[model samples]
Target: WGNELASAAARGDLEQLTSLLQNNVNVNAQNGFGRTALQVMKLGNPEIARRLLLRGANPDLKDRTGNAVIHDAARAGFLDTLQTLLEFQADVNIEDNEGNLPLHLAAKEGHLRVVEFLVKHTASNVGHRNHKGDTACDLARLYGRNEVVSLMQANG
Candidate 1:
């Protein structure tokens, strides 16, 4: 029922979302995919993220796969959106279904800037392992993200 809001955010339409929010539409409503507007928002649009967050959208809302928008932004290398999520108090260390934090996903995907931001700005658990017993450092090594591995090592 709230798919309109979800679709608008997914399309990154600031105008439509602003109108909807002005009308007091439920910011936390789930779409057909069982995700809220923030959960499915276009990753590159930090302004859109900010608007939703201002309207009380829950950045920590998880999908059916048990991963939040923070995980999505981190995995997709969307530093801007990830920053907005952190600004809204999203947990940097929130776990997915498989016990993977956003750091684990970002490191696994070789997202250097996202990894750097997570490592630098947030108190992410660097030594944390996933259900597979692999730390973010381990995943970066596995995926051959050498620069990412170096960054983490240098920080610690």
Candidate 2:
């Protein structure tokens, strides 16, 4: 059930999902692996994400690995999805199960646009430390993302 929903969401098949929902499928249902449609959509389609959320998907629901939809979107540099999640009041400061916040993920991945947008909205915790005790600036410097490091420093 979860796998089917996730695949539909990944393919951005809103019509199929709508039909499934009408057929009494659980919109927020988790797969056998504890993954949700929103989690899968975060890997690619923000439009599907919006659709899921509109249909009452829980953005804060974590996978078995304890990563939320917003965490996945941020790590993948899905700025539009991130923005949408933020507008939906996703917790900006919430860390993944690994204790890495969105800022840390974006900086480590060298996503300057994400970093800039996060800073602009004051949505990122530049000083947040991951489980490894590395902050976003630390990750940026370690990864040689100089511009991201600069942005962290400037924003701080």
Candidate 3:
């Protein structure tokens, strides 16, 4: 219903989510952050999002920060999450509050595998600039993410 779906998602309470859905609760409901059940995640259980999606949760819905599961999965470097979000057609180029795309976040966070997956599976833009005018390569270099820097360079 209200934050129930988001709360259930964050805590990975699949049973409760199922129960709520059975009663016709809106899986698309957002919390104060505007996060739908599909956008809520726990690092240990991205599968919950997959479950939510199968039950008709919207993947393209953005949070208050203009972040979708693409931002979440990329930031955390969760391949499973990325794959599921991809299956739902999550926009790869969508930017967050800071104007950073999923590629930028994955690269900025030193997630080389995530970066590679995004580049391979989605529309990638290595030269995209955030509010600070920093590209993924620049962020990786500034943040000293050696693997990510190499990954971006290799992506070119």
Candidate 4:
């Protein structure tokens, strides 16, 4: 049942998702990979993402990799999904198992819009350090994202 939900979300099949949910499928169900429908939707399609959320999907749920939907969205630099998740009040300060927050992923990926959006929404710990002792600013600098580093510095 959960696998079907994940598969439907991964394919961005909004109609199938609606049908499944209407059939009384668990919207927050997790697959064997520990991926929920929301996590799969984070791969693409903010519209489907919004639908999943509307059906009561857990945006804060983490996968086997300990990455929440926000973390994956940040890593993928999907500004639409990220914004939607933020609007849903997903845990902005939530960290992965590695102790890296969504901002850390966005900075490392050099996603300027994501970084700026997070900053504006106060969605991350600007000074928080990960397990590797790397802050978001550190990641930006290491990845040659000078603009992001500057933004982090300004926030600090």
Candidate 5:
């Protein structure tokens, strides 16, 4: 992994991460892209995310593109990542710059666990329309994520 937490987290390099943490580097520092360690976290491993959360990483922090940690978790199909952010009280219904919430991102990829969990534990935002005028159900339909289609149909 590189010196930044983004690289460390993305590569799942726990050993290097632990060393950085022990060395007391700035865990919350952002890169040139305005991505704090927690912002690009879904690109990394769960352990890095777990540690960052415990170590005061901001769950609500966003990158330049307005993608929050939950967005990345949803996009990456990492329910563990989503759950971690949720445990930190991350907003499940929070929207990105494109008006895509976690549900919207997850639905496009057919991320069943993330989509279903959002439907269950968090506030369901199935009816949210993105900039493209696509709802979560619409995205699921386009991607053939029938399970999500069923979920949106049943929940609505």
Candidate 6:
């Protein structure tokens, strides 16, 4: 059932998810990849995420790689999914395998909206250093995310 839920979420199959949840599937159950359904859900589908979260999915569950759903949502520039995660109390400061925060990944990806939201709305530590000793600003600058850098500099 865990694998089934994860596969449903990964495929963005909300109907399958509903069936699994109705069967009393564990919301936080990890799949073969050691990732919960929330961790592997389609980034573009905030509704699926919200449903899982409503069912008590652990928003902060890290996979074997230490990445939560927020990390994937930010990196993938899914603003809606990120917002939904945040509403469910996902930690914006949670670090991934490389000690990179969701803010860092959003900045690195040049996701202006996501970066801005992380900076302005969430409790994101803009000055947090990753394993590479680089802050979100530094990563944004290095990645040629000029607009993101400016946004960070102005608000950071």
Which candidate has the top score in lDDT?
A: 6
Write one digit per residue (lDDT tens) for candidate 4, span 53-79: 887888898766788889988987998
Displacement of the residue 67 alpha carbon in candidate 2, Å: 1.2
What are the per-model C-alpha RMSD values against the true structure?
Answer: 1.2, 2.0, 2.0, 1.7, 2.4, 1.1
Q: Candidate 2, residues 1-156: lDDT per residue as tens digits?
A: 567787787677877766665655666887656678887773556667777777778888876677787777777788898887777777888777789888888888999998889877855767677898999889889999999888778867
Scored by lDDT, model 4 comes in at: 0.85
lDDT, candidate 5, 3-60, per-residue tens: 3776666567777677777766676777656667666554536777888888888788
Model 6 lDDT-worst window of ten: 18-27
Clashes of 1: 0
Model 3 Cα lDDT, one tens digit per residue, 1-156: 848878887888878776776766777777877677777656456667777777778877776678877787888888787778778776778888999988888888899888888776677776788999998878889989998888778857
For model 6, what is the alpha-carbon lDDT of residue 91? Answer: 82
Q: What ranking of all candidate models by TM-score puts the best one first?
A: 1, 6, 4, 2, 3, 5
lDDT of each: 0.89, 0.78, 0.78, 0.85, 0.79, 0.91
> What is the per-residue lDDT of model 1 for residues 18-134, given as tens digits with 9 covering 90 to 100?
888877577889889777888878879998899988988887777778989999899999999999989999889999999999999899999999999889889999999889899
**Count of clashes, each model:** 0, 0, 0, 0, 2, 0
Q: What does candidate 6's lDDT look like per residue over 26-124, in tens digits?
A: 878888977888988977989999999998998988877898889989998999999999899888899999999999999999999999899898899
Candidate 1 pairs with clashing backbones? none
TM-score of each: 0.95, 0.87, 0.86, 0.90, 0.86, 0.95
**After superposition, candidate 4 runs with Cα above 4 Å error:** none
In candidate 1, stretches whose alpha carbon ends up further than 4 angstroms from where it belongs are none
Model 6 scores a C-alpha lDDT of 0.91
Candidate 5: list runs displaced more than 4 Å.
1-3, 42-44
Error of 6 at 6 (Å): 1.1
